[PDB]
Amino acid sequence: KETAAAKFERQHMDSSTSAASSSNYCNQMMKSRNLTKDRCKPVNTFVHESLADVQAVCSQKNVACKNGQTNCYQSYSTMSITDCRETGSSKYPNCAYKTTQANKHIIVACEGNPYVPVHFDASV
C-alpha cells in the first residue's frame, strides 16, 4: 500500500516544469501519474515547486482545513500550480481535462514524523 506522503507526491508534485506550457498538460499528467486507472479522477492540482519548498509549508501558517481539522498549513508565498478538471467531453477510458495554470498560495494537510504533506486542501 502506498504511504500517505508518497501518494501526495505522486498526485500533487510536478517540480520538473516551471508551469503548464499547454492545454494538453493535464491530459498527459493525469494519465502518467496513474490518476485515470478505473475512472477519471475529477479534480487534481499539481504544484510546480521543489519538493523541499512544498514540504516546508508544513511549518508555515497553521489554518483550518475545509473539513474542520486543524493540521492544515497555508504557504506564505504563492506557488506555480496547475489545476486539472474533467471537461464535459470526458468519458472513461477517454478522460479529458481542462488545464488552468495559476500562481496561488497552497493549503496542505500535514501528518507524521517527518511532518509532511498528506493532502492538498485548496489553493488561494
**Least separation, in Å, of the C-beta of 24 and Cl ion?**
19
Nearest to 51 by CA among 87, 8, 90, 88: 8
Nearer to a copy of itself, 52 or 67 (CB): 67
Q: Which residues contact 45 (CB under 8 A, 6 or more apart)?
A: 12, 81, 82, 83, 84, 106, 120, 123
Q: Flag whether 117 is marked binding.
A: no
Say if residue 45 carries a ligand binding annotation: yes
Residue with cell 486543524: 70
- Residue 75 binds which entry of Cl ion, a copy of itself, none, CB below 5-8 Å type-dependent: none
The answer to whether 48 is a known catalytic residue is no
Are 85 and 103 in contact, with CB atoms under 8 Å apart?
A: no
User: Which of the choices a copy of itself, Cl ion, none does residue 120 contact, using the CB cut-off of 5 to 8 A by kind?
Assistant: Cl ion
How far is it, in rounded angstroms, from Cα 22 to Cα 86? 16
Q: Of 66, 91, 92, 112, which lies in the binding site for a copy of itself, with binding defined by CB under 8 A?
A: 66
CB of 12 to Cl ion, least distance (A): 7
27 binds, among a copy of itself, Cl ion, none (CB under 5 to 8 A by kind): none
Which distant-in-sequence residues (6+ apart) come within 8 Å of 100 by Cβ?
Answer: 82, 83, 84, 85
The verdict on 104 binding a copy of itself (CB under 8 A) reads yes
Q: Does 93 bind a copy of itself (CB under 8 A)?
A: no
